[PDB]
Amino acid sequence: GDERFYAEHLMPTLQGLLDPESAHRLAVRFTSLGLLPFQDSDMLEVRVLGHKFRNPVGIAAGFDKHGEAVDGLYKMGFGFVEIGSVTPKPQEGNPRPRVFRLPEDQAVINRYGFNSHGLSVVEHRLRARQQKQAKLTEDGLPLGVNLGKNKTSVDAAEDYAEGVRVLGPLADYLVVNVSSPNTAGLRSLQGKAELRRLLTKVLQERDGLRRVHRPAVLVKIAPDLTSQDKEDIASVVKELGIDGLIVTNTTVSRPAGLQGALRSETGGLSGKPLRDLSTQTIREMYALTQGRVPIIGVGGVSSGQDALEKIRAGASLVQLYTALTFWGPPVVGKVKRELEALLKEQGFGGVTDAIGADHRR
Ligand X SMILES: O=C(O)c1cc(=O)[nH]c(=O)[nH]1
Ligand Y SMILES: COc1ccccc1-c1ccc(NC(=O)/C(C#N)=C(/C)O)c(Cl)c1
Query: What residues contact 94, with CB distance under 8 A and at least 6 apart?
Result: 111, 112, 113, 115, 182
- Least distance between ligand X and beta carbon 220 (Å): 7
Q: Which is nearer to ligand FMN, 141 or 176 (CB)?
A: 176
Q: Which is nearer to ligand FMN, 108 or 285 (CB)?
A: 108
Residue 182 binds which of ligand X, ligand FMN, ligand Y, none (CB < 5-8 A, kind-dependent): ligand X
Residue 320 binds which of ligand Y, ligand FMN, ligand X, none (CB < 5-8 A, kind-dependent): ligand FMN
From the list 319, 311, 305, 320, the residue with the least C-alpha distance to 291 is 311
* Among positions 111, 310, 312, 336, the unique one binding ligand X when judged by CB under 6 A: 111
* Among positions 31, 133, 177, 190, the unique one binding ligand X when judged by CB under 6 A: 177
Residue 101 binds which of ligand X, ligand Y, ligand FMN, none (CB < 5-8 A, kind-dependent): ligand Y
- Least distance between ligand X and beta carbon 131 (Å): 30
Q: Which is nearer to ligand Y, 30 or 38 (CB)?
A: 30
In 97-128, which positions are buried (b, 16+ CB within 10 angstroms) versus exposed (e)?
A: ebbbbbbebbbbbbbbbbbbbbbeebbebbee
* Among positions 31, 55, 85, 251, the unique one binding ligand X when judged by CB under 6 A: 85
- Maximal CA-CA distance, the chain: 53
Q: Which is nearer to ligand Y, 101 or 111 (CB)?
A: 101
Residue 153 among the catalytic residues: no
Burial (0-12, 13-18, 19+ Cβ within 10 Å), 3: middle
Which of 116, 180, 270, 316 is catalytic? The answer is 180
Question: Would you give the end-to-end CA distance of the chain in angstroms?
Answer: 39
Find out whether 308 and 56 touch, Cβ atoms under 8 Å. Answer: no
- Least distance between ligand X and beta carbon 346 (Å): 32
Rule CB under 6 A: is residue 112 a binding residue for ligand X?
yes
Q: What is the chain's length?
A: 361
Q: Which residues pair with 81 in a beta bridge?
A: 59, 143
* Among positions 55, 250, 251, 281, the unique one binding ligand X when judged by CB under 6 A: 250
Residues found near ligand FMN in the complex (CB under 6 A): 60-62, 65, 84-85, 99, 108, 110, 112, 146, 177, 220, 249-250, 270-271, 274, 298-301, 320-323
- Least distance between ligand Y and beta carbon 198 (Å): 28
Distance CA 243, CA 342 (A): 29
- Least distance between ligand Y and beta carbon 158 (Å): 30
Q: Is 20 annotated as a binding residue?
A: no
- Least distance between ligand Y and beta carbon 282 (Å): 23
From the list 27, 323, 13, the residue with the least C-alpha distance to 5 is 13
* CB-CB neighbours of 264 under 10 Å: 9
* Among positions 113, 142, 168, 260, the unique one binding ligand X when judged by CB under 6 A: 113
Chain-centroid distance of CA 171 in Å reads 14
Residues 11-70 that bind ligand Y (CB under 6 A): 14, 20, 23-24, 27, 30-31, 63
Residue 60 binds which of ligand FMN, ligand X, ligand Y, none (CB < 5-8 A, kind-dependent): ligand FMN
User: Which of left, alpha, beta for 106 (phi over 0: left; psi -120 to 50: alpha)?
Assistant: left
Torsion on CA atoms 159, 165, 169, 171, rounded to nearest 10: 10
Find out whether 173 and 215 touch, Cβ atoms under 8 Å. Answer: yes
Write out the catalytic residue numbers.
180
Question: Which residue ranges make up the site for ligand Y (CB under 6 A)?
Answer: 10, 14, 20, 23-24, 27, 30-31, 63, 99, 101, 108, 324-325, 328-329
> Residue ranges for the binding site for substrate?
65, 110-114, 177-182, 249-250
